[PDB]
Amino acid sequence: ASIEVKVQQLDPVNGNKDVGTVTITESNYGLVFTPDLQGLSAGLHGFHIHENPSCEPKEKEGKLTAGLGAGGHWDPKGAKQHGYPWQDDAHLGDLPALTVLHDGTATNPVLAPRLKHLDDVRGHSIMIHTGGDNHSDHPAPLGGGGPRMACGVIK
Amino acid sequence: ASIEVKVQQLDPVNGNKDVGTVTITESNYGLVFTPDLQGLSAGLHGFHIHENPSCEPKEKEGKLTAGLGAGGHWDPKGAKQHGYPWQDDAHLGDLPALTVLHDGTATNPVLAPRLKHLDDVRGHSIMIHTGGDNHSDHPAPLGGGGPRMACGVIK
Ligand SMILES: [Cu+]
Ligand SMILES: [Cu+]
Ligand SMILES: [Cu+]
Ligand SMILES: [Zn+2]
Ligand SMILES: [Zn+2]
């Protein structure tokens, strides 16, 4: 059983760019997110499920802003704070951070132990941020993820 | 509760170098390994518990070889194959790979869902390899980790 999610680098001016997939599978310990990506900025990047099945940009403060259509971190249990993948009182969408290798590719899978069934993440989006993720809202909100670099809709 | 493991970059010629710690804690989903490391080569590195509570080098083919005193991947259930952190018929010491950031530091924690109690990993060693970890013995043995870059003894 798997879900293949098509991911794009987001660029409301010059055009979104295909960068590959993230394939979601079930393990005995929770959902596994296996990237097969290329063309992304190298680094450790915040990686979360967001609430809406959208990667569209939205206007904010006069600027068409990448990925805001996805809404916020998926938080169906109302934890109302950002945390660790293994933290029960954190947003359910908080995944382990995504490692983009030096050359822009990403293949290292990560486990979300609080997500147990594929159908639970359908109708949401997966987001890759420009910044990292310290799994806290301190000192920066939402782990320091900042802007939205790439995204896919989980169908 | 936690175990603080001192980690050194291994160099049998010029001398080992202190590179920080890995702190092991218990979560409701298994053991969490939180690095606070510096001075390591940037990249995604294989990260495993090895059998012996040793990081000493050993002679092989006329060469004092870094970290061989630790022995092989910890495999108390006798899986006899390298695999994923969430794979029950893989070596129990198979952890998620460790992300060393571009500047040589490492702070991103990783979860080992098959490890449940701190006492279970006492008396072993934790190893950071020069290569990565594709979580298979194909195409390269032991995930492609290759040589032993840094190590600590879990006590
Ligand atoms: Cu996010
Ligand atoms: Cu299921
Ligand atoms: Cu190893
Ligand atoms: Zn969050
Ligand atoms: Zn192994």
UniProtKB/Swiss-Prot annotation, chains A, B:
One of its GO terms (biological process) is removal of superoxide radicals. It is found in: Periplasm. It comes from the Bacteria. Its cofactor is Cu cation; Zn(2+). Zn(2+) binds at residues 73, 82, 91, 94. Keywords: Antioxidant, Copper, Disulfide bond, Metal-binding, Oxidoreductase, Periplasm, Signal, Zinc. One of its GO terms (cellular component) is periplasmic space. It is an enzyme of class 1 (oxidoreductase). Binds 1 copper ion per subunit. Binds 1 zinc ion per subunit. GO terms for molecular function: copper ion binding; superoxide dismutase activity. Cu cation binds at residues 48, 50, 73, 129. Its EC number is 1.15.1.1. It catalyses: 2 superoxide + 2 H(+) = H2O2 + O2. Disulfide bonds join 55-151. Belongs to the Cu-Zn superoxide dismutase family. This is Superoxide dismutase [Cu-Zn]. It comes from Neisseria meningitidis serogroup B (strain ATCC BAA-335 / MC58). The gene is sodC.
